[PDB]
C-alpha cells in the first residue's frame, strides 16, 4: 500500500449527512450530477491518489527537481511526471472548471473534497495542475478577445503561475517594483525580478505556461492601488489557433532548496532580462490588478487549508495503523506485575490521548473547510443555510483566513503527535510522517504568513464588515447551544463558554482599535492579540462542528446503525466530547490574556532582545 | 560568520549573578579554578563552536554518513571529522572529567554551560565526544581491574555507546531479549540484535569504542531486574598497555536514514551473529544492570535538554538578527498612509510577540538546566542552596525529566516561531532554522519518549519520593512570592500558577489513590501526566525568569549602563511577558485535569 491513507467515509458524512449538499445535486447548475455519481467520483479520485499519485511522493523528495542553467528550465523526476500524466489522463485537472471550458459543474464543497485526496497523496501534483482554474479566472476578468486565449489555455491544459512576490515585496505586496512599459502596439514590456514563484517552470509537462504577473505601469502611483495584472505567456502563440510560437522573455534563474515540498519547483523568475522582452497583455485591458488577483488569492487560501488538513489526516491514519500493531509495555493497570502480558500501544492512555487529539483536529478541520465551501456557491448556501448571495460571500470571506491560518498552524502542530506515536521509528525516513511535517511547514507562509492572515481576518473580515458575517456564524453556534439531546448537554455548556470567550476577545480587541484614535499605540495590542484570536475562533468553530456531527451521529445510532457505520458514529461522539473538554477550556485563559495585553513589549528597546 | 550564535553573556549572568556558582570556585574540589578562568573558558569554547565546530553543521546534513554493509563501518564527511579534531585538540571531550582521568575539575553547572556551545553549533559532535564521560561512569562502577581499563579508555579518548534498545524493546527496556552466555573463564558472550544505537560506528574518529550493553544472562528472571550491563569493546586490547588488538564480534549491520541529526550514525548493532563472539565483561562483576545504566541515563537526559535549549537559543538569535535587518511594511500606526515609510519587522507587534516568546523560553530553559546542575555537586548545592547531599540528589532526580521532557517539547515547538520570523526565507535550506527543527525532533524520542519521561516524573520522582523534592522546590517558589512593588504583578501571577500546579498534582494523586478501589482510575494519571510535566516546566521557567528579573532590577538600580543595561532590561521584559502570557494557561489546564474521564479509554479501537 502507499503512504496515502484516505477518508472518503468522513467526507461523505460531512457532505451528505451533516451539510446536505445532496439537496442541490441533480437540479439546475448541477443537473448533470447526482449524489451517487458524486460518491463514485470521490471513491475514484481517492483510489487514484492512493495509487499513481502517491507512488511518486517519496521520489519527488529524495530526487528533487534540478535547475538547468544551460536552458533556464527545471527537470522533474520521471516518477512524478508519470503521476502528473495519471492526473491529466483522468481529467481531474478540470473538476469544478466551468462547463464552457470543458469542466464538470459541481458544488465547490464536492470539488475541494476531491482535491483533498491529491493534496494528501502528493500535494505538488495539484499545484502544477492549477492551470485550468487560473485560465478560468483569466477568462472571467478578460476582454472578449482575451477570453478566446483563456479558452485555448484551458483546453490545451497550459500550466499557470501567480507572480507577485519580489525580494523586497512579500507581505507588503504594494511595495512591488516590477515595471510595465506600454508599447506602441498596446502590449506591455514587463521588467523585473520575482521570487518564490511556484511552478514557474515545469519541465515538459505542458506546452505553455500562463504567468499572471503583477507589475506597476510606468508613472502609476504607489502601493497596491498602482498595481496592474498582466498575462505573460512563456511562449508567444497564435491568438486564434493556439499554435505555439516564439519564446517570450520570462525565464527561471534559480530553483530554491527548501525544507520540504521539494518536488514543487519554487523559482526566481526574471522578466525582460535575458535578451528578449517579456511581452504582457493588460488583463481586462483595465488597471485593476489587486482586485483581479482576488479570486486567485481565495483559491490559494482554500488550497493551503485543504492541503494542511489532507496531510494531517493521512499522518493520523498512518499513526493509528502503526499504534494498532505495535506491542510495547504492560497495561497501566498491571504496572506492578512484571509477568503481565504486553499490550498494543493503543492501550496506553497517553497514546489514546494523542490519537484522539489528532483525530479531532483532523475531522474538525475537514468540517471547517467543507462548511466554508457551502458558502462558495449561491445555490448551495441558499439550499443548506437559507442565506442570500451577498451574506454567503461575506461569510466565505470571513472563513477563508480560518481555513488557511488556523488550518496551517494546527496541522503542522498536530503532526508532531502523529510522529510521536511511532516512537523512534517516526524520526525515520522509512515512514512518511517526517516528510509530512517538512511538506507542511510551508502552509504558514504560502499566500501570506499567519500574522497577515490574522490581521486580514480582524481588520478586513470583521471590522470593515462591521461584524455582520461574524454575527451570522455566532448566531448559528448559539442556535445549536440553545437547541434541546441530554447526551450533548455538557458539550453545549462548554461551547457556550467558548462562544462567550471568543466574544470577549473580539470586544477587547475592538476596544483597543477604537481607542487608537485617542492613543495611536493602542493599535499595537490588536497586533499582539490577532493571531491568538484567529486560533481561538478556529477552535470554537472546530468544537461547534464536531458537536453538530455528534448530534447527527446520535440520531444515526438511535436509528439502528450497525457494524463499521456504528463504529464511525461512536468515534464522532467521542471526538466531539474530547475536543470540548480538552481543547475549548483553554480559550478562557486566552481571553484573560488578551484582556490584559499591554504595550511593554512594544516600548522595549530593540537592543534589549 | 557561522550559523551558530552563542549567548555567553546569559550563561555568566546565571552562573555568577543569579545562582552564585562563583562561591565554590577557588576552594576545595575547585581550588585551581577561579571565576576569571571560568569566564575565559566559556568565551573560548564559544569562539571554537562558532568557528571550526559550526563549520561542518551544513555538510554533515547535506553529505551524510555512508554505510558499507560488508565492512560494517560508516564513512563520515571529512569536514565533520575536522570539527571533531578541533574539539579533541582543545581537550573539550574531557570537560568535567575527573582529575584522575585527565580532566579539569569543575562544577557541573559550568560543565553544561561549556557543552551548550558544542550542542548549539553541531550537536552530533558532542554526542560522538561522549566517550570519556562514559568511561568515568564505567570507572565508578567497575572492579579495580576494570578501573584500569576505564582509565586507558578515558585517556586515549575512546568512543562509547549505550546499547539498550531492540526492535521489540524500546520504551519497555525490560522486554530485552539479547542474551549473555557465561564462559568458564568468567567472560560472557553476548548474542542479539540492538537498534537505534548512536555512534555504534564512528569511522576513524577513535582507536576503539566501548559499548556498554544491557543483556539478560541465560536463565535470569524477566523484566529490568534480570538485566546486567557488559563492557563490550569494538576491538580487544591489551589489558595492561591498552594496545589495540583483534576485532571483537560486535558489528553494525544498518545505519538509519533519519529526518535530522543525520551525521550521528544511528545503528543496528549485531552481537555474536557473524561467526565471532562478542566478548563482554560484567560491569563491576555484579548483576545490577539497570541500576548501573542509570548514571548513563541521567547524563543522557541532561544532554538532550541542553541540546534542546542550545538549538532554540541559536534559532532565536538567528531570527532576531534577521528581523533587525528585514524591511517590510509600514508601522501599524500608519496602516492608512500609503506614503508611510517602510519599517524593519521588529516594529511589528506580532514579530515582537514572536521574538519575546522565543527569548523567554530560551532563557527560561537555560535557567532550568543551570538550576538543575547546581544540585549535581553536593558542595554547590550546599553553598548556593543550603541543602544536603541526599535532598540535592532527589531534587536533581526530580528536575531531569523537566530538563529532558519539557525542554525537548518546548524547543521544537518554539523553533516554529523562529522560522516564521524569516517568512518564506525560513523554509529555505539557505538559513539554518529548518535544520534546527529537523535536528530537534529527535529530542522527544531519544532516551525515552515524553510520555515515559512524564510517567517517570510522576510515579517515581514524586509519588515514590513522597513529594519531598517537589515540596522543596515549591517552598522556594513560595519564598520568592512572599519576599519589591515592581514585581508585584509577576508575583501574583506566579502564586496563581503555583496553586494551579499544586492543584494538578493533587488531582493526579487522587486518581492514583482511587485506583486502589477502581483499577481503571489509573488511566487518568496517564491521560494527564504529560500536561502536568509541561505545566511544572512552565512554572519553573516563570519562577526562574522572575528571579532573574529581581537581580536585573538590582543591577539597573545600582547604575548599569550600556550593553549591560540593555541586557538587564530584556531580562525584566522577558520575565513579565512570560508571567502574563504563558502562566495563565495553567489555570485552564488545571480545570481540564480536574475534569479528566475514562471515555477515551472505553472507546472501541475500531472507532478511532
Ligand atoms: C535518533 C535516535 C537515537 C537513539 N539512540 C539510542 C542509543 O544510543 N541507545 C539506545 O539504547 N537507544 C537509543 N535510541 C532508542 C530510543 O530510546 C527509543 O526510540 C525510545 O526509547 C522509544 O522506543 P521505540 O522507538 O521502540 O518506541 P515505542 O516504545 O514503540 O513507543 C511508541 C509509542 O508508544 C508510546 N508508549 C510506549 N510504551 C508506553 C507506555 N508504557 N506508556 C505510554 N506510552 C507508551 C510511546 O511514548 C510512543 O509514543 C535512539 C532513538 C533515536 C530516535
Ligand atoms: C514555498 C513557497 C512558495 C511560494 N509561492 C509563491 C508563488 O507562487 N507566488 C507568489 O507570488 N508568492 C509565492 N510565495 C511567497 C508567499 O506568498 C509569501 O507572501 C512570502 O513568502 C511572505 O513574504 P516574505 O517571505 O517576503 O516574508 P516577510 O514579508 O519578510 O515577512 C517576514 C516576517 O515579518 C512578518 N511581517 C511582515 N509584515 C508584517 C506586518 N505588516 N505585520 C506583522 N508581521 C509582519 C511576517 O509575518 C514574517 O513573520 C511563496 C512562498 C513560499 C515559501
XYZ file of N, CA, C and O in Angstrom, chain A residues 313-384:
288
model
N -4.574 14.400 8.089
C -5.457 13.245 8.086
C -4.677 11.978 7.756
O -4.776 10.982 8.473
N -3.858 12.009 6.694
C -3.058 10.829 6.385
C -1.964 10.600 7.425
O -1.651 9.453 7.741
N -1.402 11.655 8.016
C -0.486 11.448 9.149
C -1.137 10.725 10.326
O -0.548 9.800 10.907
N -2.356 11.131 10.676
C -3.112 10.488 11.755
C -3.408 9.035 11.441
O -3.150 8.151 12.277
N -3.919 8.773 10.235
C -4.281 7.403 9.907
C -3.043 6.517 9.797
O -3.099 5.347 10.144
N -1.904 7.054 9.401
C -0.687 6.248 9.455
C -0.299 5.980 10.904
O 0.074 4.868 11.267
N -0.366 6.988 11.756
C -0.029 6.749 13.155
C -0.937 5.710 13.789
O -0.492 4.916 14.636
N -2.229 5.771 13.439
C -3.236 4.916 14.042
C -2.970 3.487 13.664
O -2.951 2.612 14.520
N -2.722 3.240 12.374
C -2.450 1.875 11.925
C -1.228 1.314 12.627
O -1.211 0.148 13.013
N -0.181 2.127 12.759
C 1.028 1.732 13.488
C 0.719 1.383 14.946
O 1.150 0.351 15.464
N 0.025 2.269 15.638
C -0.300 2.048 17.039
C -1.116 0.775 17.242
O -0.955 0.090 18.272
N -1.976 0.434 16.277
C -2.782 -0.781 16.455
C -1.928 -2.038 16.428
O -2.314 -3.059 17.007
N -0.771 -1.972 15.779
C 0.080 -3.121 15.530
C 1.253 -3.176 16.486
O 1.736 -4.257 16.782
N 1.676 -2.063 17.039
C 2.883 -2.043 17.852
C 2.602 -2.516 19.260
O 1.853 -1.863 20.016
N 3.297 -3.571 19.659
C 3.224 -4.114 21.016
C 4.338 -3.525 21.850
O 5.525 -3.589 21.471
N 3.975 -2.910 22.976
C 5.004 -2.351 23.850
C 4.452 -2.050 25.230
O 3.550 -1.216 25.391
N 5.022 -2.709 26.224
C 4.687 -2.471 27.606
C 3.455 -3.236 28.110
O 2.667 -3.832 27.362
N 3.317 -3.218 29.415
C 2.113 -3.748 30.056
C 1.029 -2.678 30.166
O 1.281 -1.466 30.077
N -0.197 -3.134 30.353
C -1.287 -2.209 30.625
C -0.982 -1.440 31.908
O -0.370 -1.969 32.834
N -1.369 -0.150 31.948
C -1.081 0.640 33.131
C -1.735 0.026 34.376
O -1.262 0.254 35.488
N -2.862 -0.672 34.228
C -3.466 -1.363 35.388
C -2.627 -2.528 35.894
O -2.975 -3.156 36.891
N -1.554 -2.864 35.216
C -0.754 -4.022 35.567
C 0.694 -3.614 35.743
O 1.591 -4.449 35.585
N 0.935 -2.329 35.963
C 2.300 -1.803 36.033
C 3.158 -2.605 37.007
O 4.363 -2.786 36.792
N 2.577 -3.005 38.133
C 3.343 -3.649 39.197
C 3.592 -5.139 38.950
O 4.399 -5.742 39.656
N 2.926 -5.741 37.972
C 3.024 -7.170 37.684
C 4.001 -7.363 36.526
O 3.673 -7.104 35.370
N 5.211 -7.812 36.816
C 6.191 -7.915 35.736
C 6.101 -9.243 34.960
O 6.943 -9.501 34.091
N 5.098 -10.072 35.250
C 4.664 -11.162 34.379
C 3.497 -10.777 33.454
O 2.957 -11.645 32.760
N 3.076 -9.512 33.459
C 1.855 -9.120 32.769
C 2.038 -9.252 31.267
O 3.156 -9.089 30.751
N 0.959 -9.552 30.545
C 1.043 -9.609 29.087
C 1.423 -8.228 28.536
O 0.991 -7.215 29.071
N 2.244 -8.205 27.485
C 2.476 -6.981 26.720
C 1.232 -6.616 25.909
O 0.435 -7.476 25.506
N 1.037 -5.312 25.691
C -0.161 -4.844 25.016
C 0.215 -3.975 23.828
O 1.334 -3.454 23.743
N -0.717 -3.878 22.868
C -0.561 -2.911 21.787
C -0.688 -1.516 22.387
O -1.357 -1.308 23.410
N 0.040 -0.567 21.799
C 0.171 0.745 22.432
C -1.116 1.567 22.401
O -1.225 2.521 23.169
N -2.104 1.200 21.595
C -3.426 1.832 21.731
C -4.066 1.576 23.095
O -5.016 2.267 23.443
N -3.528 0.659 23.906
C -3.975 0.512 25.288
C -3.405 1.567 26.236
O -3.870 1.667 27.371
N -2.399 2.352 25.819
C -1.821 3.303 26.758
C -2.577 4.626 26.761
O -2.838 5.201 25.693
N -2.910 5.147 27.934
C -3.619 6.436 27.966
C -2.935 7.542 27.149
O -3.619 8.238 26.405
N -1.625 7.740 27.256
C -1.083 8.894 26.543
C -1.206 8.724 25.035
O -1.341 9.715 24.307
N -1.165 7.475 24.564
C -1.299 7.206 23.135
C -2.732 7.435 22.667
O -2.973 8.039 21.597
N -3.716 6.984 23.441
C -5.091 7.314 23.078
C -5.357 8.829 23.134
O -6.111 9.358 22.314
N -4.831 9.519 24.146
C -4.934 10.972 24.165
C -4.356 11.574 22.879
O -4.974 12.419 22.242
N -3.156 11.148 22.497
C -2.518 11.647 21.272
C -3.371 11.366 20.038
O -3.591 12.251 19.196
N -3.824 10.114 19.887
C -4.611 9.748 18.729
C -5.944 10.509 18.695
O -6.366 10.958 17.636
N -6.630 10.652 19.836
C -7.883 11.407 19.802
C -7.644 12.894 19.487
O -8.480 13.531 18.850
N -6.522 13.470 19.929
C -6.180 14.839 19.563
C -5.996 14.955 18.067
O -6.484 15.909 17.427
N -5.283 13.995 17.487
C -5.056 14.012 16.058
C -6.374 13.857 15.307
O -6.645 14.563 14.323
N -7.168 12.883 15.727
C -8.452 12.621 15.078
C -9.385 13.822 15.150
O -10.029 14.176 14.161
N -9.555 14.396 16.342
C -10.471 15.512 16.483
C -10.063 16.706 15.670
O -10.915 17.357 15.063
N -8.774 17.051 15.651
C -8.373 18.172 14.834
C -8.478 17.840 13.361
O -8.919 18.669 12.574
N -8.104 16.635 12.954
C -8.240 16.318 11.530
C -9.701 16.437 11.099
O -10.015 17.043 10.065
N -10.607 15.873 11.882
C -12.009 15.877 11.457
C -12.620 17.247 11.603
O -13.496 17.618 10.816
N -12.219 17.976 12.642
C -12.691 19.338 12.829
C -12.244 20.260 11.719
O -13.036 21.056 11.202
N -11.010 20.077 11.233
C -10.558 20.898 10.120
C -11.297 20.537 8.839
O -11.559 21.408 7.980
N -11.594 19.248 8.657
C -12.291 18.840 7.449
C -13.680 19.468 7.434
O -14.113 20.061 6.428
N -14.375 19.376 8.571
C -15.674 20.017 8.689
C -15.578 21.498 8.397
O -16.437 22.048 7.693
N -14.531 22.175 8.904
C -14.371 23.614 8.650
C -14.276 23.916 7.154
O -14.930 24.847 6.660
N -13.416 23.198 6.412
C -13.256 23.618 5.025
C -14.499 23.292 4.204
O -14.820 24.018 3.271
N -15.188 22.203 4.513
C -16.383 21.866 3.770
C -17.518 22.800 4.152
O -18.234 23.300 3.281
N -17.644 23.118 5.443
C -18.558 24.197 5.847
C -18.325 25.478 5.055
O -19.255 26.042 4.446
N -17.076 25.957 5.055
C -16.698 27.122 4.272
C -17.131 27.015 2.814
O -17.655 27.982 2.230
N -16.913 25.846 2.214
C -17.252 25.677 0.813
C -18.760 25.691 0.546
O -19.150 25.991 -0.584
N -19.599 25.435 1.541
C -21.030 25.585 1.299
C -21.444 27.053 1.154
O -22.603 27.327 0.826
N -20.549 28.008 1.405
C -20.843 29.405 1.161
C -20.263 29.920 -0.134
O -20.465 31.103 -0.451
N -19.575 29.068 -0.898
C -18.923 29.454 -2.142
C -19.781 29.224 -3.373
O -19.325 29.543 -4.470
N -20.971 28.641 -3.216
C -21.981 28.554 -4.280
C -23.259 29.179 -3.752
O -23.749 28.774 -2.689
N -23.795 30.161 -4.480
C -25.056 30.776 -4.083
C -26.147 29.730 -3.927
O -26.936 29.767 -2.974
N -26.180 28.771 -4.839
C -27.206 27.732 -4.809
C -27.116 26.942 -3.521
O -28.125 26.678 -2.855
N -25.892 26.559 -3.142
C -25.717 25.673 -2.009
C -26.026 26.406 -0.736
O -26.651 25.856 0.191
N -25.536 27.642 -0.637
C -25.743 28.444 0.562
C -27.230 28.693 0.807
O -27.702 28.706 1.955
N -27.965 28.983 -0.260
C -29.411 29.158 -0.123
C -30.034 27.856 0.339
O -30.734 27.816 1.354
N -29.685 26.750 -0.329
C -30.314 25.471 -0.023
C -29.985 24.972 1.376
O -30.865 24.443 2.070
N -28.715 25.053 1.798
C -28.371 24.450 3.075
C -28.395 25.428 4.243
O -28.512 24.986 5.391
